[PDB]
mmCIF file of the C-alpha atoms, coordinates in Angstrom:
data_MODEL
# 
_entry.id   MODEL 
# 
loop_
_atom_site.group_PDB 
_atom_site.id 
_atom_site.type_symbol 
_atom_site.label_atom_id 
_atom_site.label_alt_id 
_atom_site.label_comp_id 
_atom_site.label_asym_id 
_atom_site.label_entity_id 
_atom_site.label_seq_id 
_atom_site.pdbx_PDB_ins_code 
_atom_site.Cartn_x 
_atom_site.Cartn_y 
_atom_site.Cartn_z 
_atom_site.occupancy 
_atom_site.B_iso_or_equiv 
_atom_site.pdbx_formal_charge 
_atom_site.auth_seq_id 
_atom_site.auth_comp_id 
_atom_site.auth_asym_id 
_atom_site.auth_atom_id 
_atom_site.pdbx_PDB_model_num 
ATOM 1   C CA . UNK A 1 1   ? 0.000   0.000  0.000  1.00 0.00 ? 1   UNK A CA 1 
ATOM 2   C CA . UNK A 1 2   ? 1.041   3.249  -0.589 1.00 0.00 ? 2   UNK A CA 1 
ATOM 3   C CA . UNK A 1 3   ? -0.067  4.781  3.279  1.00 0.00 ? 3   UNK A CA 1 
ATOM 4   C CA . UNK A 1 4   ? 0.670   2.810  6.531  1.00 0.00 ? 4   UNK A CA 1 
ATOM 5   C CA . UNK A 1 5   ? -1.896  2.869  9.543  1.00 0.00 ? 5   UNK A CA 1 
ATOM 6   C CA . UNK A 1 6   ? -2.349  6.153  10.769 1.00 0.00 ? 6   UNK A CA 1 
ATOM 7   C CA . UNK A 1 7   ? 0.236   7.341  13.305 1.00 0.00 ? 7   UNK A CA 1 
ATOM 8   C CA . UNK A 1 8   ? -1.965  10.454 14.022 1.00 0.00 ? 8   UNK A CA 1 
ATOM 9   C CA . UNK A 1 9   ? -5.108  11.446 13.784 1.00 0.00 ? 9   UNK A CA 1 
ATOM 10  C CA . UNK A 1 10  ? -7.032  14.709 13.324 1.00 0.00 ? 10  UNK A CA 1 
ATOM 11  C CA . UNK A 1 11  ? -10.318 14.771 15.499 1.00 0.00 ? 11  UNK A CA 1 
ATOM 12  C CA . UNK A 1 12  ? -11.963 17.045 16.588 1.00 0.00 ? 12  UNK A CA 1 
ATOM 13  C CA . UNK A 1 13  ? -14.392 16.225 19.818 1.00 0.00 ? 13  UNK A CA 1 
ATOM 14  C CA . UNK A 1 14  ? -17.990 17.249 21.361 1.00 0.00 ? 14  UNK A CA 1 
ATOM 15  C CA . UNK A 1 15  ? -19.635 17.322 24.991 1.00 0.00 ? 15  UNK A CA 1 
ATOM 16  C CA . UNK A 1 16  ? -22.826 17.266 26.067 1.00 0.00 ? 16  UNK A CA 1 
ATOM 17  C CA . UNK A 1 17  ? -23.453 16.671 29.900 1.00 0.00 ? 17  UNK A CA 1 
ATOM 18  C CA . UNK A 1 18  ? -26.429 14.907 31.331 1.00 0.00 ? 18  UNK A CA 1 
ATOM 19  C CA . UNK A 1 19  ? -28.194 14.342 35.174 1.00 0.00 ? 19  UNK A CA 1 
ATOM 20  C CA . UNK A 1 20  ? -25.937 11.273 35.640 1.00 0.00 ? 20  UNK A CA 1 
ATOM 21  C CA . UNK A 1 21  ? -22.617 12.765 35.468 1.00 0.00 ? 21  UNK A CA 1 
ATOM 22  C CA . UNK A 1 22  ? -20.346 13.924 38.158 1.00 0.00 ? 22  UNK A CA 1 
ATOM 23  C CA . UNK A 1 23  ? -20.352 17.913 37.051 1.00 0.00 ? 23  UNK A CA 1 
ATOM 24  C CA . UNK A 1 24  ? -23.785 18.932 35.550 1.00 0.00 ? 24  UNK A CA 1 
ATOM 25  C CA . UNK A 1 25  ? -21.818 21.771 34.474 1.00 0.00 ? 25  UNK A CA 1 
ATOM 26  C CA . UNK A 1 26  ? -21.101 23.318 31.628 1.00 0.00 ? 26  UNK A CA 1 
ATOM 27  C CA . UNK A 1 27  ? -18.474 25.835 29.990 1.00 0.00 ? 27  UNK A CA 1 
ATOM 28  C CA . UNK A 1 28  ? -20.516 28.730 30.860 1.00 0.00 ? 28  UNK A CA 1 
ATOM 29  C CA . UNK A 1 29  ? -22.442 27.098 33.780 1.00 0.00 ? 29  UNK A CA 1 
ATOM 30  C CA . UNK A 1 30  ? -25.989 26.598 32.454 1.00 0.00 ? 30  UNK A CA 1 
ATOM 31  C CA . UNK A 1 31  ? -28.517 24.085 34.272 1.00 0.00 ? 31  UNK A CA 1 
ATOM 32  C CA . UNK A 1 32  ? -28.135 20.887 33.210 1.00 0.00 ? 32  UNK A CA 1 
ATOM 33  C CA . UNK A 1 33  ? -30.871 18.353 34.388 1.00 0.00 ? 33  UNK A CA 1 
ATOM 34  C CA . UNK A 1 34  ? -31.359 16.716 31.008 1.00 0.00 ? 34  UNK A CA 1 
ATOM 35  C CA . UNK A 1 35  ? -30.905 12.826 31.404 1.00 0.00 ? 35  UNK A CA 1 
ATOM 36  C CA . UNK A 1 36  ? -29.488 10.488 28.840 1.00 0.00 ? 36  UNK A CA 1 
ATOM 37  C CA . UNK A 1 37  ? -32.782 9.601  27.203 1.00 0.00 ? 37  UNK A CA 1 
ATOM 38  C CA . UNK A 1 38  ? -32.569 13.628 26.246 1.00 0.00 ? 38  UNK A CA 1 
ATOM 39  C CA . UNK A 1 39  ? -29.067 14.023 25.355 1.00 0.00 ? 39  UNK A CA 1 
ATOM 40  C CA . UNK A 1 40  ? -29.429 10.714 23.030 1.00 0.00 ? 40  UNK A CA 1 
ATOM 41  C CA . UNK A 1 41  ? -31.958 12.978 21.035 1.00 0.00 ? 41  UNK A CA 1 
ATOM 42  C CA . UNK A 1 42  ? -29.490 16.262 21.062 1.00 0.00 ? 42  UNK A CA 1 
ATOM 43  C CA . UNK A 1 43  ? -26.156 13.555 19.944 1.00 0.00 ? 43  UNK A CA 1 
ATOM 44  C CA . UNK A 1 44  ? -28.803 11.282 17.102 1.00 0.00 ? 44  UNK A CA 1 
ATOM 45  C CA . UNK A 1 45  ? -30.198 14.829 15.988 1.00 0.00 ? 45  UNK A CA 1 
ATOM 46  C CA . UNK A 1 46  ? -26.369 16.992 15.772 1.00 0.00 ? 46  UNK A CA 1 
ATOM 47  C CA . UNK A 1 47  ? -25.224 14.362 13.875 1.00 0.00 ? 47  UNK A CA 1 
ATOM 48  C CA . UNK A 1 48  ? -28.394 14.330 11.268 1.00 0.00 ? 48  UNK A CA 1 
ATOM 49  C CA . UNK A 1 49  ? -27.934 17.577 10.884 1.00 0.00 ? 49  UNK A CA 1 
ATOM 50  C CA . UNK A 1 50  ? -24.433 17.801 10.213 1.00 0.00 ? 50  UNK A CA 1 
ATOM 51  C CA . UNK A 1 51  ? -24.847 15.443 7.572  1.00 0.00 ? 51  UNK A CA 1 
ATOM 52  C CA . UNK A 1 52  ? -27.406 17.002 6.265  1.00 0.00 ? 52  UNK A CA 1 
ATOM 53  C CA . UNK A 1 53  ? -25.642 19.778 5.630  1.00 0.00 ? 53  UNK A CA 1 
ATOM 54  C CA . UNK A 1 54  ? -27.380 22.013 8.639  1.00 0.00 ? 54  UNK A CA 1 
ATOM 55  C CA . UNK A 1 55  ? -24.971 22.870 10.152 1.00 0.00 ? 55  UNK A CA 1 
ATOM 56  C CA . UNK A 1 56  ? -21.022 21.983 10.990 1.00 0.00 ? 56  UNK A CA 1 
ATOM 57  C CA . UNK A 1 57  ? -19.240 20.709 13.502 1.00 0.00 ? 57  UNK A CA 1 
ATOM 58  C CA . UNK A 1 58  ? -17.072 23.391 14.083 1.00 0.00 ? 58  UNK A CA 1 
ATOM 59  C CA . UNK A 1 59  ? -20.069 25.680 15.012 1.00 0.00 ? 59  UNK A CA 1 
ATOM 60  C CA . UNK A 1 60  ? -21.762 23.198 16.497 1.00 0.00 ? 60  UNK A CA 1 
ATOM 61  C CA . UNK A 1 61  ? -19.084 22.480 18.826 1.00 0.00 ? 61  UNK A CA 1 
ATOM 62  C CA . UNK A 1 62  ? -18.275 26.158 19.803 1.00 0.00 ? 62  UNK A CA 1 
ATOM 63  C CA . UNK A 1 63  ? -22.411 26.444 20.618 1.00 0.00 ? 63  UNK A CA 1 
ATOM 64  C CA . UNK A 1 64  ? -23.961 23.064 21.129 1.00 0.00 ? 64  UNK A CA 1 
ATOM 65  C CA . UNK A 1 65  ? -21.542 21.280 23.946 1.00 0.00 ? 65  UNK A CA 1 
ATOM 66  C CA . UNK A 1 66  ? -20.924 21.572 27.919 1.00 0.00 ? 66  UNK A CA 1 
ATOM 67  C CA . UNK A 1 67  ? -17.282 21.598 27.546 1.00 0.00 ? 67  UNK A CA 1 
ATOM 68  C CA . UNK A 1 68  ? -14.631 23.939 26.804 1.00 0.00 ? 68  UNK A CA 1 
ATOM 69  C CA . UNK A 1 69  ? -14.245 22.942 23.319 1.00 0.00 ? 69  UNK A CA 1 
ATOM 70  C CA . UNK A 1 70  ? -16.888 25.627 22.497 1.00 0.00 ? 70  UNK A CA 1 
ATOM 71  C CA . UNK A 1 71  ? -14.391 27.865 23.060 1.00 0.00 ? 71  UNK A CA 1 
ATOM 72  C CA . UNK A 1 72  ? -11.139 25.679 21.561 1.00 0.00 ? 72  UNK A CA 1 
ATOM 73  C CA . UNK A 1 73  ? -13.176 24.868 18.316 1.00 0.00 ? 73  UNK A CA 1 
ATOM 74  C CA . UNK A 1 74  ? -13.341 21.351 19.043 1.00 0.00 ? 74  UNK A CA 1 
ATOM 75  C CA . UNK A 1 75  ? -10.227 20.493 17.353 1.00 0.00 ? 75  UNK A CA 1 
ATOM 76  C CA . UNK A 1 76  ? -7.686  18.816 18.998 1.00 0.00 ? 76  UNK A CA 1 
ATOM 77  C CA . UNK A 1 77  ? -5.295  18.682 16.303 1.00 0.00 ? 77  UNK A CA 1 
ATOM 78  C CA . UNK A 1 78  ? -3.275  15.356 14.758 1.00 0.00 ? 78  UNK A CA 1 
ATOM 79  C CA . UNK A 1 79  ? -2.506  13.273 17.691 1.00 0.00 ? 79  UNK A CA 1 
ATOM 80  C CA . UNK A 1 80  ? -0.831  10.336 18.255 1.00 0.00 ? 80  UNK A CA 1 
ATOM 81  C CA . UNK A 1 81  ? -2.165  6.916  19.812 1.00 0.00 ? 81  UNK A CA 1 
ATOM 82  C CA . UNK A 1 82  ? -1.610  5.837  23.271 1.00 0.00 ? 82  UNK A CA 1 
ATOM 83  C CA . UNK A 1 83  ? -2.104  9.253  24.833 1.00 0.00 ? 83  UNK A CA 1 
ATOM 84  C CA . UNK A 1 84  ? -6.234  9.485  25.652 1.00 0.00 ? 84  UNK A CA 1 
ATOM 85  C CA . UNK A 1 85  ? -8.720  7.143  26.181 1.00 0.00 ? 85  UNK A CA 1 
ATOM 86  C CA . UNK A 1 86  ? -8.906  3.773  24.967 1.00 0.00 ? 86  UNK A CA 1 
ATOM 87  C CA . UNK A 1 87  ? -12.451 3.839  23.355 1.00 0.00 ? 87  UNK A CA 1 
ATOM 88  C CA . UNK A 1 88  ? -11.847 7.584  21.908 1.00 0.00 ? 88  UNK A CA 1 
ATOM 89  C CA . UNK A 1 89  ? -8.223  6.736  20.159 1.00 0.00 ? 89  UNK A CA 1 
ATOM 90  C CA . UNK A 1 90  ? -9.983  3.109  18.904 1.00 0.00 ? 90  UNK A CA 1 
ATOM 91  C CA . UNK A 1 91  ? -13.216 5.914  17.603 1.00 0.00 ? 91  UNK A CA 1 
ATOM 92  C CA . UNK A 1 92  ? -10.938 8.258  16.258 1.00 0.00 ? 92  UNK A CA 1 
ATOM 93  C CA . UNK A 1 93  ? -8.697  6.048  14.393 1.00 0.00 ? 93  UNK A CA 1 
ATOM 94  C CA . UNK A 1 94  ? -10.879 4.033  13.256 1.00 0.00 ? 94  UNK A CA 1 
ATOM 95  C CA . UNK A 1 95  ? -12.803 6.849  11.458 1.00 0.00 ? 95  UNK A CA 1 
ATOM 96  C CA . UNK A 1 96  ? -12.143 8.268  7.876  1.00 0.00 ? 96  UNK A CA 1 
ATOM 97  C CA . UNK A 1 97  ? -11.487 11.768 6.734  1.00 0.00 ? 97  UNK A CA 1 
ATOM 98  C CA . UNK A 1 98  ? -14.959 13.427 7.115  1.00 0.00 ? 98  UNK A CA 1 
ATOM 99  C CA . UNK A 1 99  ? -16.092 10.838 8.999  1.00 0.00 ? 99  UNK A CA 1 
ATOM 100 C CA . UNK A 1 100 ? -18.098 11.588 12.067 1.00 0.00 ? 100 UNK A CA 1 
ATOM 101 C CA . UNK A 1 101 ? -18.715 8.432  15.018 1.00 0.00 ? 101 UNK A CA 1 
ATOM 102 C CA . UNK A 1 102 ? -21.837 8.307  17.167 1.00 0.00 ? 102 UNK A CA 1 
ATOM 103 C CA . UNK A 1 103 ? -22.152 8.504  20.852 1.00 0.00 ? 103 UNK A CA 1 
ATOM 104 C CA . UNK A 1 104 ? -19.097 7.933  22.510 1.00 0.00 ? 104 UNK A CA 1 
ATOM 105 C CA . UNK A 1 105 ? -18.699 7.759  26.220 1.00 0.00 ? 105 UNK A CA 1 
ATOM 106 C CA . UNK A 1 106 ? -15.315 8.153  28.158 1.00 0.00 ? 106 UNK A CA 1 
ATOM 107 C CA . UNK A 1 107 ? -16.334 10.849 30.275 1.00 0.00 ? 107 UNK A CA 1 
ATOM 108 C CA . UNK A 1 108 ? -19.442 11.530 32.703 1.00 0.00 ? 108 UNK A CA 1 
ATOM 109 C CA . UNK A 1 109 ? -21.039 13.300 29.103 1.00 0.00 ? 109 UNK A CA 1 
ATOM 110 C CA . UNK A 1 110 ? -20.866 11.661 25.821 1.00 0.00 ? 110 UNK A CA 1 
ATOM 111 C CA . UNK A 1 111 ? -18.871 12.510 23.128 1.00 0.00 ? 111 UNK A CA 1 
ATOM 112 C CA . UNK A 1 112 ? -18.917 12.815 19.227 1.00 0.00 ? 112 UNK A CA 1 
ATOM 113 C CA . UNK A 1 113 ? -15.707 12.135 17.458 1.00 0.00 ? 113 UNK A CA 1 
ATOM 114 C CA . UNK A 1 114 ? -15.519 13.855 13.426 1.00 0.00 ? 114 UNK A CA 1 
ATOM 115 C CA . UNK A 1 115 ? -11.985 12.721 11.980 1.00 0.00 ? 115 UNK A CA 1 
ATOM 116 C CA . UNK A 1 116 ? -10.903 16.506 10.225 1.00 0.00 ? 116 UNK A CA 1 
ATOM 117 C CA . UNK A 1 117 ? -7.933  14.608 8.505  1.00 0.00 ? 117 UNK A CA 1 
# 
């Protein structure tokens, strides 16, 4: 083959809390009561959408999440395995340019992996 396995990927990551987590909280400390059951909706519908062609990641992440990615862009750049989580590098990796995982949990809140590069 002409590439080897990926060394590095580019991912970019979002967060949405829920009522069972251990910091309801989020980057600009709204209320967060919302269980799973609701969150599931927010994660199946963000990802519709940005497949649809709604709206991006990128701006969804910087609105849409309870973490401080809203304000990093959700990018975290072309990293290297054995460095985070487990289930997020085996996501990550295992996703194609412009491809975008489901709902991920390795935190309290659930995640959504989209592989930039």
């Amino acid at each position: 083959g002409s590439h080897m396995e990926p060394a590095r990927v580019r991912c970019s990551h979002l967060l949405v809390k829920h009522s069972q987590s251990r910091r309801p909280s989020s980057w600009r400390q709204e209320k967060i009561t919302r269980t799973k059951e609701e969150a599931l909706e927010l994660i199946n519908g963000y990802i519709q959408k940005i497949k649809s062609g709604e709206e991006d990641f990128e701006s969804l992440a910087s609105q849409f999440s309870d973490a401080s990615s809203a304000k990093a862009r959700g990018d975290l750049g072309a990293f290297s395995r054995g460095q985070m989580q487990k289930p997020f590098e085996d996501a990550s990796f295992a996703l194609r340019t412009g491809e975008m995982s489901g709902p991920v949990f390795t935190d309290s809140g659930i995640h959504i992996i989209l592989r930039t590069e």
